[PDB]
Design a protein around this motif. Structure first.
Motif, mmCIF file in Angstrom:
data_model
loop_
_atom_site.group_PDB
_atom_site.id
_atom_site.type_symbol
_atom_site.label_atom_id
_atom_site.label_comp_id
_atom_site.label_asym_id
_atom_site.label_seq_id
_atom_site.Cartn_x
_atom_site.Cartn_y
_atom_site.Cartn_z
ATOM 1 N N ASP A 168 20.253 -43.067 30.280
ATOM 2 C CA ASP A 168 20.225 -42.232 29.083
ATOM 3 C C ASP A 168 21.599 -41.924 28.507
ATOM 4 O OD1 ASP A 168 17.453 -42.215 29.264
ATOM 5 O OD2 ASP A 168 17.334 -40.221 30.176
ATOM 6 N N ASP A 169 22.552 -41.559 29.366
ATOM 7 C CA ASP A 169 23.912 -41.216 28.926
ATOM 8 C C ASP A 169 24.528 -42.311 28.040
ATOM 9 O OD1 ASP A 169 26.578 -40.450 28.606
ATOM 10 O OD2 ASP A 169 26.973 -40.119 30.736
ATOM 11 N N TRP A 170 24.152 -43.558 28.288
ATOM 12 C CA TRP A 170 24.689 -44.677 27.522
ATOM 13 C C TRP A 170 24.120 -44.871 26.110
ATOM 14 C CZ3 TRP A 170 29.023 -47.007 28.957
ATOM 15 C CH2 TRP A 170 29.359 -47.084 30.312
ATOM 16 N N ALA A 171 22.975 -44.262 25.813
ATOM 17 C CA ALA A 171 22.348 -44.432 24.493
ATOM 18 C C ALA A 171 23.301 -44.091 23.350
ATOM 19 C CB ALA A 171 21.081 -43.561 24.401
ATOM 20 N N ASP A 172 24.165 -43.125 23.636
ATOM 21 C CA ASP A 172 25.194 -42.545 22.778
ATOM 22 C C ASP A 172 26.414 -43.473 22.646
ATOM 23 O OD1 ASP A 172 27.218 -40.734 21.764
ATOM 24 O OD2 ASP A 172 27.574 -39.951 23.788
ATOM 25 N N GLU A 173 26.448 -44.544 23.436
ATOM 26 C CA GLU A 173 27.625 -45.418 23.450
ATOM 27 C C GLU A 173 27.390 -46.917 23.334
ATOM 28 O OE1 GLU A 173 30.210 -43.607 26.752
ATOM 29 O OE2 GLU A 173 28.400 -42.357 26.821
ATOM 30 N N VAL A 174 26.440 -47.271 22.485
ATOM 31 C CA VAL A 174 26.045 -48.640 22.186
ATOM 32 C C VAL A 174 27.225 -49.475 21.664
ATOM 33 C CG1 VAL A 174 24.633 -49.961 20.533
ATOM 34 C CG2 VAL A 174 23.673 -47.991 21.720
HETATM 35 CA CA LIG Z 1 26.905 -40.494 26.405
#
Ligand SMILES: [Ca+2]
Lengths: 182, 181
Positions: A168-174
């Motif tokens: 989830d944390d990565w959704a913000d960092e595509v």
């Molecule tokens: Ca993030």
């Protein structure tokens, strides 16, 4: 008077309100997901069902003997993935019925050793907890049918979940035009 | 209770939806069958944000009315809000919960009838033999908004009453072989 039940160790779903209520009258709440492998899981279900069938029986047994009935959804549900989620809730305030005032109730939260905490950690999804509660049967209404409320009495925090770092944390960092799953 | 009808953005169905047939858990309680699907939609799709706006507006409006009604003559149950029928998953998507009963008692005739949920393909063709819709399937849904007051069981919120479904793309282990033997 209320009998206290204790849940099996489970995993808190996201959006828990334990360290602080969700605010209108506030409500503390947590959806606790327990592995069906835990036998305590089935016993929790049995107790809730028994409570409901007895209480609903009585409710109909007086609706009919001094009227002015349908059943609702249980406060638990098997997720079909080997786990069952239970919904616990309680109000954050009440009316002093002696001396009229509204009073705030803080939900007691204990650590794994049973120590009550004054400054309670915010409980993120994935945290492991055990909860003590009461069964509060309620009658049918215009919105939902008769069922049982799992009234939160206290919580034991067994494992505090990390915030971030996962999928989830990565959704913000595509990353534009990069590698894409297979 | 299919009055003002809204259409969702294109989303992905969560596993264990009951669209091709309803959920007759009967799970003692509402005997009534239930059609349901949890639809997860990307937050960057503009319709997703509008869907939320509409539900929130419906809720705010009905809750405000219920509260004024209550405060106009407090008749121990105080006003409070329940959870919205949607939730941001923290991963750039929001899941909306749609459901409707599989039967109803007719108003004019009092006959209890079963409701077959209309499912359409991507070009609007009604599907006569509805496939079981598995997790990962791409869908759009039509629904109505049903606000409700707080009560002993739950706080004031809004039901997303499922009206019909468009199957845009159908998705292709151990449940059956649990424990011993
Ligand atoms: Ca993030």
């Amino acid at each position: 008077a209320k009998k206290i039940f204790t849940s099996a160790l489970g995993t808190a779903e996201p959006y828990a309100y334990i360290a602080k209520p969700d605010y209108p009258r506030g409500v503390y709440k947590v959806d606790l997901t327990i592995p069906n492998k835990d036998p305590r899981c089935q016993r929790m279900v049995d107790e809730i069902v028994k409570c409901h069938e007895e209480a609903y029986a009585a409710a109909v047994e007086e609706y009919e003997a001094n009227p002015p009935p349908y059943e609702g959804d249980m406060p638990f549900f098997d997720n079909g993935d080997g786990t069952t989620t239970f919904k616990f809730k309680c109000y954050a305030s009440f009316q002093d019925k002696k001396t009229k005032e509204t009073k705030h109730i803080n939900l007691v939260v204990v650590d794994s050793k049973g120590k009550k905490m004054e400054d309670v950690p915010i409980i993120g999804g994935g945290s492991k907890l055990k909860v003590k509660y009461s069964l509060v049967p309620y009658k049918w209404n215009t919105a939902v049918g008769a069922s049982v409320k799992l009234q939160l009495e206290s919580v034991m925090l067994v494992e505090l979940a990390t915030f971030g770092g996962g999928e989830d944390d990565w959704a913000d960092e595509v990353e534009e035009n990069g590698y894409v799953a297979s």
